[PDB]
DNA sequence: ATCGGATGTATATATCTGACACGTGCCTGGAGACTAGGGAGTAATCCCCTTGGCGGTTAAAACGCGGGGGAGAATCCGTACGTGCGTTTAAGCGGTGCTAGAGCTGTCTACGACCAATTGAGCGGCCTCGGCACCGGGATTCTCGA
DNA sequence: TCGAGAATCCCGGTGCCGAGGCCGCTCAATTGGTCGTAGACAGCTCTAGCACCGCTTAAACGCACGTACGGATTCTCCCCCGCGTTTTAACCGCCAAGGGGATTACTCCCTAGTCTCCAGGCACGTGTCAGATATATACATCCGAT
């Protein structure tokens, strides 16, 4: 049959690869098309020069990998590798943020 | 057969979404996750969700503030020092 | 009457003369000491080059002659006193420390 | 009888009749509950009551409901 | 398999004659020229229901981007509303069974050749039927699709608005005369909400390029419908948007009721504003963005409107921290019952997200709400 | 118009420490908006030093405290040793 | 003429002079507008009649007419926006809140 | 010297609220810490607005929009109300 | 005699409405001057000032008390052990 | 017992018995063994960080009493503001 | 456990390439040199608040002994998430054009700083009484083992 | 379910000490002047953010297999709760001395201010080589079969 891994090591290889690395995981146009939304709530048009929606990235993706890791943490005190919801809502609490 | 609006402005949809689940998973592989649960895509989302709109309130606030139409890269610095995510690199 | 930048009486490659006009400036107090801003030029110096000096150490680990805002990052986060001073502080292009939990890699 | 609403959210009776002046009810409230007469205007119908009219003036009926405001500070 | 409109959407009660039987029966031929579709920036001819001369044309192309303007979707809306609303029986269900099934699937499809094909028998059908029928039909309607008056407006909108609208991004501030619309769904809901009904008046407060006017002055029938403005730009896209209206609702025998525009003159300090507040049983401010002094100006002038007045608003017009101490016995504020509402999505123009939006009621008496400390506060204690 | 910052200064500190290593635009950013935020919290601490004390002036005594309270552990102890120096030096010439 | 104070003139308690002398006395900047002050006064005002009228609240749901830490700890937290812009802050001789999980009730 | 405090304003706001309520020295101190502390709050969160803005002057605007960033929710909208209508009351005198 | 969780649930109702600080004054005093004696000043530690770090410190302990707890429930236990301190003071950043 | 007496390890002081009623006003039904001794440590590195910025702050006023006002000060620094001992 | 197959990825070398480093004009901020005010250093005094002790009481801590209830380990289910593959989607690059919003420069007029005289708001001290703490006793409500 | 039994709540009376209100007495807020300049408004420049289109292909998405890990069940067992007795030290109350934290008064050196001089660094421009990217290959790692 055709070679396949085993659950997990292409996990640990993306875990080794995106770790190393430093460049955006979240699409540009995406992002940016939701922070254009996020400030359409406002009835002015506003701009978002481009460094700033390229700091809102930046932002957003550190928050959310040490949310990510936070909740890794949850998880493997709960004796458990799968992140659930419960972990994320977990970490906030923890955290301060609700 | 489909309906159609647009207005003065082209008003996003819900662009939640465009936060795909290989993005959520990239991020979470990035903070040392080896495994992801199914509702951990909609649960993020809400929380990125939430946490952009404080930080675009507070830019927007002080773009307000300065009487511009446009929020510049300072304005989303001193909106993140002031939740306590002090950004390097754009000023 | 030479000119002699403050910053050379200091021995400081900083601009003390910079820092002293960013505390008239700042509205930190009514009045600001002179020697204040060298202990401050000082301090600050002194800071950058514990920075530059772990970021080369670790450009140099990656065979690199460039710093690079990981080689930035990983100099504040590989040290424990750096990463408590810069704790809440993101550094964009930074990344993360390469660190994946025990229980995760494969038995 | 009447009722009267105070900013409080406090009801308070009066026992008056029809030809009872705007005056006397000032000073009944003033002596039920020690809020003098200069500080305290009175509101029904969304109309203000005045010193110089009369109940009957502004036709009160039975059961009816004032409203009492109290000058804190003014301007 | 979809359609173009929603058959099954909200039906709409008319309580006036909305569509002109005697300017029908009396006029047959169209003199009108509307802004045609050809013109904005393969061709289909639209042939007019009513008025045999008219003939609209349509860039019917499925390459170009459809994201400002669809004519294909247009022309789809036309000519199932023409099924639903404007032909009678037995001449309903052929234009029914005929093209709709094709022409969906040709917008489906993207089928050009088939689109244009079913416009040109949707015509041909729609020539050979007596116009004595369908006037007599116009003339027996009761109620029709809410969204037609809505798709209408667009269509009014699209001829008028879009030409221009990025001339409407010229505001200066960002916390006063800035621009932002109200779709027609949520204007129909207000409307529905405040009971606005024949012989009533309506006023706007920044009419911006008067589509609360137009809209109310269309499905609820006022007496008069007035809206005031104060930007250029908007008020000169309120006078096209007006004049386009104008000629599409003598296109469709669609009486317009008394409309009027007060633009490019503030209403705080306004002469006519401030003598049609006292017959308004309706007033509209768009306050979303409006700062306190002009919300304190709103409240001055707002200060004679008259009983049973609902005042339609995003922003309450009273101060969340309103109180009655001194300059309160007099003022008109005391007496409004204030509703809050939450708004549904697609409900304004500048969002999807959407919000609240309060309908204050001018009470006979001060308003009871207040005199609680409960209502004062934001939103019990103990251990 | 001109905008200052502390490219040059930072670059010069490099070229002491690690003369063949170089620095990236976005890495020269970086430790600009490292040395500002650094100034600003220094600064606004020894301007609530000066103001509990009641004192009008920020001297060399605030920034010290400031730097004691802020930078934790060694990095205390090697910025104030660093600040005595360069005050002691700035003061005799 | 007759002194009318400020705080007279603006409807409130709080003493907006002070409010400006303190502006004026912090350095937050060089110049102080006029109407600053009043506008943070009457912030201020609201604050505390909020914190207060919720710590009344509480001593009264707990037959006191006197307003301890309790009951300016049981204000604070229980209302949303209160704690959420008191989250960092400890308020002495307040305790916390009753608060047991519902896995910890008996089954 | 004299030991100055908001405690006679927090008792006439008490008062003013709850007229039948009295506040112990704890509760007093505890509130006057809680006034003095969102004072520095929101006056040095304009003196940053001012600084970015290089602007010398607090005014009415930067302590509203101090006041929108610092509180949450409807407790911004309703201090923003009372501030303006403060600030619209004074200025009509 | 009351089985176990009772007692424990009650001790947790009356210390959630109550307020005393719950370590004892003297002990505490104690452990904060020892705390400061790496200063070879000999400080005087105004009594105001003991108050202040019993406040801070008592505060601190319950919010990680209750951090703990919740580290606990999520583990499907309900005793707190050291990895639950350990995990919530890992995850606020303090360590 | 030389010049001044060197106060003896005094964090058995605060006992088992405080550290479970700490728990039991933070919702805790249940306390392991070990916990006791884990919450002693974390007090201690609280107690340090806390009292070494006061003794900051009291050494740069030149005192040697350390005021409450000092206390609180040290604690507003790390985001732990006190209410209730002046500010 | 150990031997091959397939895979990823690491190393290596070659060829770009645009961002980094260095050179130069100059101008705006830093530096030298008085001048004068006042904030801060230093000295003297008061007395508040700290240390230390001391002794008696009494609540709380520590020790010890059941025991049962929750922690942890082992087993088994099944389903839900990981991994490839083929398809579809649209992000990213890469050009062009619009024009309007940020930035800079030039009035000048309102506005806030500063200063002097005035006095009522606000704070330090001292009654003083009533709201809250303590204590005895009775009613209430929950808890547990039958 | 019932009874017995322990916290807990409440009712009343007593006691007390600290919140509230009053009285001086400062001195900081208010009023009334000028006068420097911050910034609001207007005009001009110009460059960057919006918008559009087309093409490539990297990435998202849907589906299918399967396997391993999350959840449930069951068992042991040991440790931590609850209760009782002894012990220990906190606590309260009271005494005392005196350390140094406020406070005031004097002097005077340091720093704000201003004026002039000048050179250090920021904008602009251009060379050129570190790094990125291309491919191509060696080596390490995972996994299936024996
Ligand atoms: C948010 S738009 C509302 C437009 C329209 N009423 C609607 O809901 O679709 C507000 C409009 O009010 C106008 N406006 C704002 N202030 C005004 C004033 N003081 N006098 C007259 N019009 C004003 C502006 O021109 C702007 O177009």
Redesign the pocket.
Known sequence: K??????????L?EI??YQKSTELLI????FQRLVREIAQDFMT?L?????AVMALQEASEAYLVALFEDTNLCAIHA????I?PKDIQLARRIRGER | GKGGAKRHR?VLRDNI??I????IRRLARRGGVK?????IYEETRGVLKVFLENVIRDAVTYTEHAK???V?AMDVVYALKRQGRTLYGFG | ???????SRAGLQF????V??LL?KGNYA??????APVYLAAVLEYLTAEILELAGNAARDNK???I?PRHLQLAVRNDEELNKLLGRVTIAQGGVLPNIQSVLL?K | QIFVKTLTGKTITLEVEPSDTIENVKAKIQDKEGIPPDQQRLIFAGKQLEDGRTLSDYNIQKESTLHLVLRLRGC | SSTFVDWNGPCLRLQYPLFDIEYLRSHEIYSGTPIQSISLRTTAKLQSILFSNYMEEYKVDFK??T??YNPMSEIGKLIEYSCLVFLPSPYAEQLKETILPDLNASFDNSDTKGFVNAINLYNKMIREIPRQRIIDHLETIDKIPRSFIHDFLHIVYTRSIHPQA?KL??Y?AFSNYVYGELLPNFLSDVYQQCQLKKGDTFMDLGSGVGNCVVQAALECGCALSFGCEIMDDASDLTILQYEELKKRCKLYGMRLNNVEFSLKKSFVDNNRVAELIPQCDVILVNNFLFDEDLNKKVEKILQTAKVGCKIISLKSLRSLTYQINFYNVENIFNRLKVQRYDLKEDSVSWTHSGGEYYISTVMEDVDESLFSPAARGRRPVKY | ?????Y???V?KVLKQVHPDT?????AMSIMNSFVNDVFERIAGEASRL?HYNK???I?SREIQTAVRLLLPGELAKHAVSEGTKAVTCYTSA
Request: net charge positive.
């Open positions: 055709p070679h396949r891994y085993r659950p997990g090591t292409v996990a290889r080794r690869r699409r540009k146009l995406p048009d701009r978002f020069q481009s460094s004796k458990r590798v799968t659930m | 082209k979404q465009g795909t689940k290989p993005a495994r992801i649960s199914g509702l511009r139409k446009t510049t | 009457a030479k000119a002699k930048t403050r910053s601009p003390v003369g910079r002293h006009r008239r009514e009045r600001v000491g002179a020697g690199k002659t460039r690079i494969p | 170009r981007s994201a400002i990025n991004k010229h200066k | 118009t001109r905008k200052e910052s490219a040059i200064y670059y170089g620095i990236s635009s976005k000066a004192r009008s002036t001297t």
